[PDB]
Design a protein around this ligand. Sequence first.
Ligand SMILES: CC(C)=CCC/C(C)=C/CC/C(C)=C/COP(=O)(O)OP(=O)(O)O
Length: 239
Amino acid sequence: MRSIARRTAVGAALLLVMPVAVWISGWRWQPGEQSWLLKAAFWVTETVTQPWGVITHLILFGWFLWCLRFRIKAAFVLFAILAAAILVGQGVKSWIKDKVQEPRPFVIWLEKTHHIPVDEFYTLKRAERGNLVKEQLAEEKNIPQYLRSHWQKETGFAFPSGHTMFAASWALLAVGLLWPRRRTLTIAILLVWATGVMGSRLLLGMAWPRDLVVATLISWALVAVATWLAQRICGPLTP
Ligand SMILES: CC(C)=CCC/C(C)=C/CC/C(C)=C/COP(=O)(O)OP(=O)(O)O
């Protein structure tokens, strides 16, 4: 267990760099940003937002099980563990957002520009908030249609970062399960991919580094258990 906590903590440290840096800078999101960088950021984000959220979890689990090389009986358990891992992560994210009631960077701008209180905006039904955001943004035209539609779709609170929990958890599961087999390429790729998603969430005016630094911390604490259980129940990572 001691190892799982250190291993994943090293990977957590590497992901934490990006939001800690974006935090210290005191960077504040602005609209109609670098068009080429926003399309690139959004597509990175598209690897994690549903339905592609399930596809990625599956593709990743498929590659994970393939590396770990478990039996049919163990494979089943490895899926149940990882599925639970990513599902507890998103379940934590919700029973926090609703309690902290933090607004999103696009919402603060959209409601400040339409001189509508952000607190009264969040008083509304998530359905009618999406109805409002579709109608208010249609007046902007400066914002691209891919992002404009993604905004209506999302709405809701910002603290902590859901995408950066899915993505951070998978890069952390890579250090927690594929580092004893020493599969560096996967660990490195998944770290960069998760970091890009964390980057993408700031770039599209959706989250604060506060959400990312806390979301990485939760993903770590959850993965450090999930990978421990996976070792005890499924079997050793190493033969
Ligand atoms: C197979 C399996 C169990 C898959 C799990 C996939 C899953 C539940 C993905 C979450 C995708 C999503 C729509 C998040 C919203 O995050 P957010 O807007 O609340 O957070 P953020 O924008 O601040 O990052």
